[PDB]
Design an enzyme around this catalytic site. Structure first.
Site, mmCIF file in Angstrom:
data_model
loop_
_atom_site.group_PDB
_atom_site.id
_atom_site.type_symbol
_atom_site.label_atom_id
_atom_site.label_comp_id
_atom_site.label_asym_id
_atom_site.label_seq_id
_atom_site.Cartn_x
_atom_site.Cartn_y
_atom_site.Cartn_z
ATOM 1 N N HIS C 54 0.835 -1.170 0.000
ATOM 2 C CA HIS C 54 0.000 0.000 0.000
ATOM 3 C C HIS C 54 0.894 1.252 0.000
ATOM 4 C CE1 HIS C 54 -2.228 -3.080 2.297
ATOM 5 N NE2 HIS C 54 -3.310 -2.612 1.694
ATOM 6 N N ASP C 57 2.103 1.936 3.392
ATOM 7 C CA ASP C 57 3.102 1.077 3.979
ATOM 8 C C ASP C 57 4.523 1.602 3.745
ATOM 9 O OD1 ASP C 57 1.106 -0.850 4.618
ATOM 10 O OD2 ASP C 57 1.340 -1.870 2.703
ATOM 11 N N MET C 88 2.895 -5.771 -7.892
ATOM 12 C CA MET C 88 1.540 -5.350 -7.544
ATOM 13 C C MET C 88 1.656 -4.195 -6.554
ATOM 14 S SD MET C 88 -0.929 -5.419 -4.989
ATOM 15 C CE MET C 88 -1.067 -6.954 -4.097
ATOM 16 N N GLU C 181 -10.448 -6.876 -5.238
ATOM 17 C CA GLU C 181 -10.373 -7.946 -4.237
ATOM 18 C C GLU C 181 -11.638 -7.964 -3.391
ATOM 19 O OE1 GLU C 181 -6.852 -7.796 -1.771
ATOM 20 O OE2 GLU C 181 -7.780 -9.359 -0.402
ATOM 21 N N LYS C 183 -14.306 -9.128 -0.370
ATOM 22 C CA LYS C 183 -14.348 -9.639 1.007
ATOM 23 C C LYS C 183 -15.792 -9.466 1.446
ATOM 24 C CE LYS C 183 -12.216 -9.386 5.597
ATOM 25 N NZ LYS C 183 -11.414 -8.503 6.513
ATOM 26 N N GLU C 217 -9.103 -13.864 -2.570
ATOM 27 C CA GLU C 217 -8.302 -14.308 -1.430
ATOM 28 C C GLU C 217 -8.879 -15.546 -0.824
ATOM 29 O OE1 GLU C 217 -6.904 -11.590 1.763
ATOM 30 O OE2 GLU C 217 -7.623 -13.077 3.095
ATOM 31 N N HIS C 220 -11.066 -14.958 2.278
ATOM 32 C CA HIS C 220 -12.312 -14.152 2.123
ATOM 33 C C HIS C 220 -13.464 -14.935 1.549
ATOM 34 C CE1 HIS C 220 -9.736 -10.214 2.169
ATOM 35 N NE2 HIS C 220 -9.650 -10.944 3.299
ATOM 36 N N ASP C 245 -4.495 -13.938 -3.821
ATOM 37 C CA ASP C 245 -4.000 -13.840 -2.454
ATOM 38 C C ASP C 245 -4.100 -15.185 -1.738
ATOM 39 O OD1 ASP C 245 -3.506 -11.007 -2.539
ATOM 40 O OD2 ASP C 245 -4.808 -10.572 -0.982
ATOM 41 N N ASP C 255 -11.549 -12.518 9.778
ATOM 42 C CA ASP C 255 -10.479 -12.819 8.788
ATOM 43 C C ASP C 255 -9.170 -13.194 9.470
ATOM 44 O OD1 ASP C 255 -9.354 -12.690 6.121
ATOM 45 O OD2 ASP C 255 -8.763 -10.632 6.491
ATOM 46 N N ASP C 257 -6.268 -14.785 8.126
ATOM 47 C CA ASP C 257 -4.999 -14.609 7.403
ATOM 48 C C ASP C 257 -3.899 -15.524 7.920
ATOM 49 O OD1 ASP C 257 -6.273 -12.733 5.879
ATOM 50 O OD2 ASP C 257 -5.260 -10.982 6.720
ATOM 51 N N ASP C 287 -1.011 -13.119 1.403
ATOM 52 C CA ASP C 287 -1.557 -12.041 2.240
ATOM 53 C C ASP C 287 -1.876 -12.728 3.577
ATOM 54 O OD1 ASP C 287 -2.583 -9.876 3.408
ATOM 55 O OD2 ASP C 287 -4.466 -10.019 2.387
HETATM 56 O O1 LIG Z 1 -5.709 -4.934 -1.199
HETATM 57 C C1 LIG Z 1 -4.705 -4.786 -0.233
HETATM 58 C C2 LIG Z 1 -4.839 -5.615 1.025
HETATM 59 O O2 LIG Z 1 -5.410 -4.514 1.821
HETATM 60 C C3 LIG Z 1 -5.561 -4.888 3.224
HETATM 61 O O3 LIG Z 1 -4.317 -5.162 3.893
HETATM 62 C C4 LIG Z 1 -6.533 -6.103 3.331
HETATM 63 O O4 LIG Z 1 -6.748 -6.599 4.670
HETATM 64 C C5 LIG Z 1 -5.995 -7.268 2.498
HETATM 65 O O5 LIG Z 1 -6.975 -8.319 2.379
HETATM 66 C C6 LIG Z 1 -5.855 -6.762 1.069
HETATM 67 O O6 LIG Z 1 -5.318 -7.750 0.251
HETATM 68 MN MN LIG Z 2 -5.999 -9.881 0.760
HETATM 69 MN MN LIG Z 3 -7.827 -11.611 4.644
#
Ligand SMILES: OC[C@H]1O[C@H](O)[C@H](O)[C@@H](O)[C@@H]1O
Ligand SMILES: [Mn+2]
Ligand SMILES: [Mn+2]
Ligand SMILES: OC[C@H]1O[C@H](O)[C@H](O)[C@@H](O)[C@@H]1O
Ligand SMILES: OC[C@H]1O[C@H](O)[C@H](O)[C@@H](O)[C@@H]1O
Ligand SMILES: OC[C@H]1O[C@H](O)[C@H](O)[C@@H](O)[C@@H]1O
Ligand SMILES: [Mn+2]
Ligand SMILES: [Mn+2]
Ligand SMILES: [Mn+2]
Ligand SMILES: [Mn+2]
Ligand SMILES: [Mn+2]
Ligand SMILES: [Mn+2]
Lengths: 388, 388, 388, 388
Positions: C54, C57, C88, C181, C183, C217, C220, C245, C255, C257, C287
């Site tokens: 992200h 991040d 990505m 994505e 969820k 994912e 999810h 994912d 969730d 993970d 992920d």
């Molecule tokens: O899309 C980016 C990522 O964003 C967040 O960290 C979500 O919890 C994760 O599921 C997703 O893959």
């Molecule tokens: Mn994810």
């Molecule tokens: Mn997840």
């Protein structure tokens, strides 16, 4: 590297399991009915130890006392011919329309009396055939709507029924114990005593609690999203694991009754690890349905994979616990410390111990890793036979 | 036609509920921290009866004994100023990193000793402030993987902790009882004693069972797909409903803690019907989170709707039970017969009764409808205020 | 018999995965923050191919353009030093309080404009660093209550946002595609486009559908109780599996993970079988969150077990498909017939074909077993390395 | 204050709904079979508009062409006598054993050809009786195990079947459209196209997408824990809500098919709000099962409560939207802003707008409350008829 069952592994099967004709809420039977004597013979050839039955699996509902005796004699001959045992029996209080609102907790009193008489008749037969455990599954005890069932009154009725059954057995001097089998829903919208915990709790209120334990089923606890090995551990801790039903389930949905090892495979691994390390010595009973896609060849293949998967998992769990590297990992994760008393020194000593509070270094303790992921990967590697 | 709470309705709120800053696993706080004295004053104005607290809600973790005394004095002044009570208190054994593997069942022995000392310190405070119930929620007691936790050893450790706490209270001569609050998962992958039934069962193995009951939460039993009114009925039947947590939940997912009445609205109706008809007399405690979308105006609106929805449902359940047409429907569905003993005549009489088996007309009994759908539509009409 | 990853296996990790400090809805961080350059170096040593990020991040929210350039330069040096790629990237539209009601579908228009500007800024950076896929996870797009969100208007707003992003990319001449994505819930009570199917359907209404696919994912889809391999098969059938994912999940709950291979292990097997047999050639992205019980040693052990479990399952799925006995079983179960057209002869020929109806022997066809249980036990034996 | 249906409300019922004899996976029928002509007459008296049918509900499987014509003539007379319509018809491709592995996606090619011929025969009849919608529910399309079904090949087969059906209809010049009904599981372990989103996505790959929409069912989306009103909103947004199935469901479990209004009552409220405000004009079809506890009096009471609950919820949703105080609350929560374009000014203008980024005050925007809880309590008060 094969995995052949023998009668010494104590594998058992309900008549209704390999005998399921494949009728589901949306479809007709796909298989013809099996004679109980054929199932006994076929299961013996596969290495099973014994079979279990509902009254109505063995003796057609409404049979005369002459037909009854005949059904039992043929059955008994097949057991004699094969060496198969009958360790468990149970009652059908769910199929007949009279049971549409329950057996022991039906609102109609007359139905509740009939449910008890039907049960007692089958306890006598069970004893005759050598069963040690009598299972109760109250699949019709519950409700689809809130006003239909006062649950306090219904638990009174359920206690009353189980107390009368315990009076009967003790009055007859029978060596038989009861096991309640929980299920959370289906066919009722909600079933009373829906989990192992609810059944354990209820048992403590009966007049003779020592006569009653649980018969948990893998797929039923998973229908509530619960950890089956954890529920079994609690039943073992209470001293109440009298019997067990083995099968598989893919999550929260209708009751699938897949063969054992299908469904949640890691849960099956941790279950076998627990039963074997706690030294459970009852039957390894399979309550499963061969999918209705299958013909009779698929039936016997499915029953054989139940036993096979148990034996493979037994081998992998034993290799896991025997591995020195695992033993070191368990110490690293402080499983040894979990088994030690928190305060064998007693309350007053705990209160006076400054290292427990006043001078306890919480940041240093917080910083210690638990090393659980390394342990869990060793467990994965053992399950998959990938130890490198 | 309004629905105004007064202190006599016994509505209580945790400090952590209206005080939730809105930090979730994916986002920062959306609201500033509330002073406990502000929450006391604001809840008093809305008609609440009292508040509850974790130790660490009231006294910041790591506070000196001088700061501690100060926090308590200000709090106590606000209670005096408002007439608010403190009927329940509990311990935070979940936030601090030291508790990452549990409090009472942490693998590290030193952590388990620290968990007990932290708890005992707060029992003294709770008693000082007049609490009658001490809640235990073991949200960190459990595992994400199967080898990390031997559950038999962990239940030994959990029993040991609760027995030491019961020894402490009785040695001090305190009038306080314990209530265990179940939750099935989150934040651990699986939590020990995951449901009301598992907690009830565990209690029967403690040295002084009469000191312990349950604090069930609406949303936690629903995280296992279970019928909350049914679980409460079993807790009432066992005599163990010491306290209750009221909120709402939309099915099987993370713990939502919506305001009471949101989530499963028919379950909320049947819950209020039960608490009121069984005459539950403890606090009506709300454990809810105002959604993080809200500002402080939305916080107090959410807390007020908790109380409002309880009162509306109370009125509709009372109208339901008082309606002659409902009373007739209950008879039609044989709820009266459910409350009568199955066999007060005793076992031998049951065995000799030919009308219970030999001459029981099963088809005639099967043919009787239960009339449950008509009853349930009367319940719907009452809930919706649509009685025609 | 080991299972060592190399960069050629295309294993990737989000910065936020090994970087998760362990803050959960009930507890503080258990680990210190990791520098992105440290994670790049540590993942390279374990055999990873690249990392994902992200915006927030990599560049702390609110960074000045000078700090921004500095963060990027250090990052870029670490990629150069290690040979790691960045295939990505994505946007954080979920942490900051401004996003409490969504990014692209926030009720406030100004927020929605800000969400788009924040996204576009990061598309430029992503392109600079060589990413081929831009992921959108709308974790704040949804509602806790029914009146808060008109979902038709919200899908209009979501379409508008994605169309503007597709206009931007094409206007800049970038070679980047979008992946949505799904969820189903958490952190919102219900999330819009909750499953792979809902995202696939939505994509067909965008102005340039060819720019958009899905990033499903494992955990999810399992939060809705769905079959993940089946959902991936549909995404592959539509030509829209742009990215994936990988992780694990124990059923319907928050969730989790977990590392890949934990959770539903048979689903992981059938997933790898599918990706490998369909020849998926994108990144194998993890992920996951190392559990907060772990220290940094447990972090890297967890990340390494992700890759290990993928490679073990790859080997077992390949052995499964290559086994002559399996190939014979697949024929026995008529998988070959499933791949043939039902009616390549056309409609009129089908209508005129008496063997399709008038003279079709339905009982003979019904009687044929599917032999699925024998096939599934061969799959079990292959997974467990128990082929006898 | 009553709530009487008339034919103008467009309420319809499947023959199989009031006709369900109460056979479940664990029990025999509790009710005798109903003649279709009796159900037509009884539903007409209750105020229904019409009925729907599977082929095999109306004409016993294996009927000769002479019996067929007779069944249809009697049916047609009852429609003429009552003014009842037949707006929808469908095929039974699930009961007969031949369909144990599916109809359109059975592995056996001959079965797949037979499934198509059986379907086409019933499309002709449906057209004759005036149906406008032809529903497809592929309850047997799926698998219990991973190797039994290649899902890419199965979607090819499913596309092929639906394309052939669209060729047939257009070649005949019929005015009939298709609606796919999703269900996630049961009776198969996993069903293909398990949700509304998966069905919408699939439709976009058919040769003539304009012929196909969805027939979503309340209880089926809830078997995946999804928000049914949200799924319907997406179907409405796509222009594909051709038909709908109304009923109730208590969470994630077997398919209950309770009467409409039971189950999740707030979801039922938000569903009616949406259908009425979007102006859905198709049938309000009930796919429900009167519980097997009931006799025929309970059957008709259950069917009447379906209609009653729809009308009560219609009134409460209309009062909700008409209330000025609600209209003000909707503005307070910025529902008006959600309906405005994010960037009607276009991309370049958005990029040049400093108030969208460079000078956007994110803290001020973050601080604004959404006022959703006050809105949701107004919705509660309206539902409960408790507006004060
Ligand atoms: O899309 C980016 C990522 O964003 C967040 O960290 C979500 O919890 C994760 O599921 C997703 O893959
Ligand atoms: Mn994810
Ligand atoms: Mn997840
Ligand atoms: O108790 C006997 C058995 O009865 C029924 O067949 C139930 O479906 C099964 O779960 C149970 O084990
Ligand atoms: O026991 C005290 C309370 O502790 C925590 O805040 C839990 O989330 C809540 O469920 C519980 O009631
Ligand atoms: O499509 C026709 C109907 O077929 C079956 O009766 C299904 O159980 C029901 O959900 C479906 O609506
Ligand atoms: Mn079962
Ligand atoms: Mn069972
Ligand atoms: Mn909660
Ligand atoms: Mn709580
Ligand atoms: Mn249904
Ligand atoms: Mn339906």
């Amino acid at each position: 590297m094969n995995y052949q069952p023998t009668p010494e592994d104590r594998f058992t099967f309900g008549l209704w399991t390999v005998g399921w004709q494949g009728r589901d809420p949306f479809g007709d039977a796909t298989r013809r009915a099996l004679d109980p004597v054929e199932s006994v013979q076929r299961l013996a050839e596969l290495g099973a130890h014994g079979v279990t039955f509902h009254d109505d699996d063995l003796i057609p509902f409404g049979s005369s006392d002459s037909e009854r005796e005949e059904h039992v004699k043929r059955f008994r001959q097949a057991l004699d011919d094969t060496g198969m045992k009958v360790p468990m029996a149970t009652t059908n209080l769910f199929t007949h329309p009279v049971f549409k609102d329950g057996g022991f907790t039906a609102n109609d009193r007359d139905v509740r009396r009939y449910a008890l008489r039907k049960t007692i008749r089958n306890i006598d037969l069970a004893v005759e055939l050598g069963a040690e455990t009598y299972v109760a599954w109250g699949g019709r005890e519950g409700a689809e709507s809130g006003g239909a069932k006062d649950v306090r009154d219904a638990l009174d009725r359920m206690k009353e029924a189980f107390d009368l059954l315990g009076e009967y057995v003790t009055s007859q001097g029978y060596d038989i114990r009861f096991a309640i089998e929980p299920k959370p829903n289906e066919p009722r919208g909600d079933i009373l005593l829906p989990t192992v915990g609810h059944a354990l709790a209820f048992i403590e209120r009966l007049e003779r609690p020592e006569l009653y334990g649980v018969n948990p089923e893998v797929g039923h606890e998973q229908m509530a999203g619960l950890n089956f090995p954890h529920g079994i551990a609690q039943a073992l801790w209470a001293g109440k694991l009298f019997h067990i039903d083995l099968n598989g389930q893919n999550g929260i949905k209708y009751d699938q009754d897949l063969r054992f090892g299908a469904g949640d495979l890691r849960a099956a691994f941790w279950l076998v690890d627990l039963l074997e390390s706690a030294g459970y010595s009852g039957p390894r009973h399979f309550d499963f349905k061969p999918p209705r896609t299958e013909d009779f060849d698929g039936v016997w293949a499915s029953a054989a994979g139940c036993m096979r998967n148990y034996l493979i998992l037994k081998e992998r769990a034993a290799a896991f616990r025997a591995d020195p590297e695992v033993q070191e990992a368990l110490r690293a994760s402080r499983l040894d410390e979990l088994a030690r008393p928190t305060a064998a020194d007693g309350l007053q000593a705990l209160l006076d111990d400054r290292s427990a509070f006043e001078e306890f270094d919480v940041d240093a303790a917080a910083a210690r890793g638990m090393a659980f992921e390394r342990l869990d990967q060793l467990a994965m590697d053992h399950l998959l036979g990938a130890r490198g």
